[PDB]
Amino acid sequence: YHIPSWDEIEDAVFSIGEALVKSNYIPDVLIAVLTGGIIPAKLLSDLLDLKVIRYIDIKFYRESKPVIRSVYTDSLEGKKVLVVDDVADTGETLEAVSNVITMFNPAKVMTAALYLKPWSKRIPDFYYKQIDKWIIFPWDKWDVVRENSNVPVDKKERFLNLYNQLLKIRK
Amino acid sequence: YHIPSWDEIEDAVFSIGEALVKSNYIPDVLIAVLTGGIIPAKLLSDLLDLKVIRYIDIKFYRESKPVIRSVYTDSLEGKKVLVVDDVADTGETLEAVSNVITMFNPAKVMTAALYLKPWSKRIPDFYYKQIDKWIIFPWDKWDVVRENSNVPVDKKERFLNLYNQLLKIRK
Amino acid sequence: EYHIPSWDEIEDAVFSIGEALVKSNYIPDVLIAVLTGGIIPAKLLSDLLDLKVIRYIDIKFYRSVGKTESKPVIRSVYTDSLEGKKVLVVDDVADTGETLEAVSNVITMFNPAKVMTAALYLKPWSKRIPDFYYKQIDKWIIFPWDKWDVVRENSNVPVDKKERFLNLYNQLLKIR
Amino acid sequence: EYHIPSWDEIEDAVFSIGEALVKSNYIPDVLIAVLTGGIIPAKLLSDLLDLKVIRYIDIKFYRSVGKTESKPVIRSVYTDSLEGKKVLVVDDVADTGETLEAVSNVITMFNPAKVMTAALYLKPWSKRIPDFYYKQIDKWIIFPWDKWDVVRENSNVPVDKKERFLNLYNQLLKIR
Numbered sequence: 037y038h039i040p041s042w043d044e045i046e047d048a049v050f051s052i053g054e055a056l057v058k059s060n061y062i063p064d065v066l067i068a069v070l071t072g073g074i075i076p077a078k079l080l081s082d083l084l085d086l087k088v089i090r091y092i093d094i095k096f097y098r099e100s101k102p103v104i105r106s107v108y109t110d111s112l113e114g115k116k117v118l119v120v121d122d123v124a125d126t127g128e129t130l131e132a133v134s135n136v137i138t139m140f141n142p143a144k145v146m147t148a149a150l151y152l153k154p155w156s157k158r159i160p161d162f163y164y165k166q167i168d169k170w171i172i173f174p175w176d177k178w179d180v181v182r183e184n185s186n187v188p189v190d191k192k193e194r195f196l197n198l199y200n201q202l203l204k205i206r207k
Numbered sequence: 208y209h210i211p212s213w214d215e216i217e218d219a220v221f222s223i224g225e226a227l228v229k230s231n232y233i234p235d236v237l238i239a240v241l242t243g244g245i246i247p248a249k250l251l252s253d254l255l256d257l258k259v260i261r262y263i264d265i266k267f268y269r270e271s272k273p274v275i276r277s278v279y280t281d282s283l284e285g286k287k288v289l290v291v292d293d294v295a296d297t298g299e300t301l302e303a304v305s306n307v308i309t310m311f312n313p314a315k316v317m318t319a320a321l322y323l324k325p326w327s328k329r330i331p332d333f334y335y336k337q338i339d340k341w342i343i344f345p346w347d348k349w350d351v352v353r354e355n356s357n358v359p360v361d362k363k364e365r366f367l368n369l370y371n372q373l374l375k376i377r378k
Numbered sequence: 379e380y381h382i383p384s385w386d387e388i389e390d391a392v393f394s395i396g397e398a399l400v401k402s403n404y405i406p407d408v409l410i411a412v413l414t415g416g417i418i419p420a421k422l423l424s425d426l427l428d429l430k431v432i433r434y435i436d437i438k439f440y441r442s443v444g445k446t447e448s449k450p451v452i453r454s455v456y457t458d459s460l461e462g463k464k465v466l467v468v469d470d471v472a473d474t475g476e477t478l479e480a481v482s483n484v485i486t487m488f489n490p491a492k493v494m495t496a497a498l499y500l501k502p503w504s505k506r507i508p509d510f511y512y513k514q515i516d517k518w519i520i521f522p523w524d525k526w527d528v529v530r531e532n533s534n535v536p537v538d539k540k541e542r543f544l545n546l547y548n549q550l551l552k553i554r
Numbered sequence: 555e556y557h558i559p560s561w562d563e564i565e566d567a568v569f570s571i572g573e574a575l576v577k578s579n580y581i582p583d584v585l586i587a588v589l590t591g592g593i594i595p596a597k598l599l600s601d602l603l604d605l606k607v608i609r610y611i612d613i614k615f616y617r618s619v620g621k622t623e624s625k626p627v628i629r630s631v632y633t634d635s636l637e638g639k640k641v642l643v644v645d646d647v648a649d650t651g652e653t654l655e656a657v658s659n660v661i662t663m664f665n666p667a668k669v670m671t672a673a674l675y676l677k678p679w680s681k682r683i684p685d686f687y688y689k690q691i692d693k694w695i696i697f698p699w700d701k702w703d704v705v706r707e708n709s710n711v712p713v714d715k716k717e718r719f720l721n722l723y724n725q726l727l728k729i730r
């Protein structure tokens with residue numbers, strides 16, 4: 037397991053920001069990959085003062101492919117676009133998103149993820165660290181605990197406490 | 208020139224409807240290709256009692272490719288989809304739309320257009336008549352008149368009358 | 379009884395709206411098509427006045443078997459920022475005016491420069507006259523784009539191409 | 555002065571909201587994230603309570619140089635039908651409450667089964683208490699997700715990693 041603190045997450049986000057500036061790529065539009073790239077997109081936005089954020093509803097059931105459910109954006113024609121996600125695992129998600137954004141004829145599509153898995157089909161133009169361990173983000177920790185309560189995350193006892201009551205009241 | 212009356216347009220729409228029913232394809236979702244496939248989608252909808260219509264904002268500047276500006280839809284997963292447009296010229300537009308809908312993982316994507324140009328790259332699964340003449344639809348007649356007032360359409364004099372005043376008041 | 383405007387009348391309706399818009403010097407930056415009856419009106423007006431920017435709102439007034447509501451229900455809003463823009467809301471008929479009002483309120487929250495409404499037809503009991511309209515009518519209107527919906531719920535209305543429709547409708551009812 | 559909640563406090567805030575939601579037996583069908591400050595709150599609550607359906611509204615209260623408005627402005631609404639659903643509106647702070655109210659009104663027009671509001675923090679002068687909240691505060695709140703926006707407009711606020719930010723910000727100001 038790799039279980040980044042928010043402090044690490046912040047450093048991941050600073051790194052991306054530093055790389056984007058160093059390489060001269062200041063996006064006009066951030067495309068958040070819902071829902072995991074939600075927090076990364078908002079943090080990068082605030083860091084680099086990027087005021088335009090759009091969103092794509094896509095999920096990779098683990099279905100054989102990622103499935104787009106909704107694309108929340110206005111015209112992207114002639115704009116500098118950065119696709120933001122939290123991790124590139126197989127890389128299917130970043131590929132599918134990049135393929136569909138391109139159809140909006142932007143000036144440029146680049147990709148950022150916080151973390152990379154070694155076996156990714158697609159390597160983000162910008163990332164923080166490549167990890168061969170199982171990553172547990174602060175925003176999917178409970179989904180991971182619901183699938184294995186033996187995962188060593190903090191505040192689990194407060195969570196198990198609430199989840200128990202939750203399980204009772206909606207069956 | 209081919210300048211279909213609404214009566215012809217209605218027959219074009221009945222034909223598509225007849226073909227869809229005869230072939231057993233009753234869509235769950237109509238995707239209107241904005242803005243030319245707008246009236247065709249609404250007429251087919253009413254004809255076949257299809258209550259679910261979604262929309263895609265795409266235009267082919269005549270830019271080298273059609274450009275998607277917006278996709279107005281919720282999940283299409285496992286649904287029977289019909290893409291509706293008014294004409295397939297080069298076929299670029301129907302291809303681009305069909306490519307992006309597929310990413311929503313529907314059950315099936317089929318295409319309908321009212322009219323086909325002989326040189327289309329993509330042939331709609333359903334169409335009314337193939338025309339090698341320049342088609343002037345009832346809903347783009349004035350765009351055509353603004354580009355050549357010598358086109359033999361009806362009510363042109365009423366239109367030239369209004370267009371003249373229009374040209375004055377917004378420069 | 380019923381009003382059944384020809385396509386020729388709808389063109390005249392659209393023309394009249396365009397003529398009134400130019401006469402009032404209100405040329406919209408953005409057309410807001412009220413889905414789905416406002417679809418054809420909005421497209422034709424777009425072509426008439428060379429208005430290239432059309433946006434859409436999915437709103438429905440449920441008045442039928444089982445599913446029935448007292449007010450229109452918005453189901454989706456299809457638009458980018460309307461901020462500082464002259465907006466014209468386009469629909470086919472204002473009946474009670476509940477739909478135009480609902481759409482006007484929701485569009486106002488986008489802070490446009492101005493919101494105006496246009497509907498082709500109007501009923502005497504509409505709770506507000508649209509800023510632009512072709513004809514006030516007191517019959518129930520069957521449009522070219524909802525005729526088969528009316529025939530389905532009322533087989534004996536006098537419409538063109540009925541037998542042709544009935545045959546298609548027959549084959550639709552059986553494929554169940 | 556300023557309130558600057560740690561990430562640890564935001565987790566506790568989210569937890570408190572979740573705990574209150576379960577205690578009230580109000581488990582939302584749909585989360586409505588108020589963009590953009592409500593983004594992180596909505597995602598974390600989604601994970602906490604296993605709520606899989608998140609929708610979004612692009613709304614902004616312009617309170618800055620040149621561009622300034624008296625009320626929030628909606629710029630886009632990102633949702634399918636909310637009809638018959640239990641909806642929870644999630645935001646980071648209710649200040650005047652003008653935003654929560656605007657979002658509540660617009661969501662109501664989708665005819666949900668119910669609309670409830672949650673904001674992590676609350677000011678004593680809010681025109682309405684959200685149905686769910688972590689803490690009433692009277693300082694101006696600097697969140698983890700808008701800290702650099704505050705530093706930019708106010709260089710002398712006491713935030714972590716300031717020098718690192720200033721160096722990046724410096725290189726941003728020059729690439730003009």
Ligand SMILES: O=P(O)(O)OC[C@H]1O[C@H](OP(=O)(O)OP(=O)(O)O)[C@H](O)[C@@H]1O
Pocket residue numbers: 069070071072073094095096097102121122123124125126127128129130
């Ligand atoms: O490279 P891949 O193999 O495609 O993996 C990457 C994607 O998988 C996860 O998303 P997910 O489909 O789980 O949805 P979520 O973001 O809502 O959690 C993750 O957030 C990435 O978006």
Ligand SMILES: O=P(O)(O)OC[C@H]1O[C@H](OP(=O)(O)OP(=O)(O)O)[C@H](O)[C@@H]1O
Pocket residue numbers: 240241242243244265266267268273292293294295296297298299300301
């Ligand atoms: O097969 P193609 O060569 O791509 O031509 C087909 C498309 O071209 C037209 O759309 P257009 O781009 O003009 O936009 P519009 O529908 O708004 O008129 C037409 O309505 C079709 O959608």
Ligand SMILES: O=P(O)(O)OC[C@H]1O[C@H](OP(=O)(O)OP(=O)(O)O)[C@H](O)[C@@H]1O
Pocket residue numbers: 412413414415416437438439440450469470471472473474475476477478
């Ligand atoms: O003035 P009102 O009393 O509100 O009625 C007018 C509305 O009713 C119809 O819409 P409908 O809700 O039936 O949906 P539709 O446009 O898809 O036919 C019509 O298109 C108007 O929008």
Ligand SMILES: O=P(O)(O)OC[C@H]1O[C@H](OP(=O)(O)OP(=O)(O)O)[C@H](O)[C@@H]1O
Pocket residue numbers: 588589590591592613614615616626645646647648649650651652653654
């Ligand atoms: O109660 P109010 O007086 O209406 O203020 C509260 C709102 O202000 C902030 O949003 P903002 O409009 O600044 O946009 P943002 O979420 O993108 O930061 C904040 O996120 C709340 O949404």
Ligand SMILES: [Mg+2]
Pocket residue numbers: 069070071072073121129
């Ligand atoms: Mg994801």
Ligand SMILES: [Mg+2]
Pocket residue numbers: 240241242243244292300
């Ligand atoms: Mg077209």
Ligand SMILES: [Mg+2]
Pocket residue numbers: 412413414415416437469
């Ligand atoms: Mg209507």
Ligand SMILES: [Mg+2]
Pocket residue numbers: 588589590591592613645
């Ligand atoms: Mg906000």
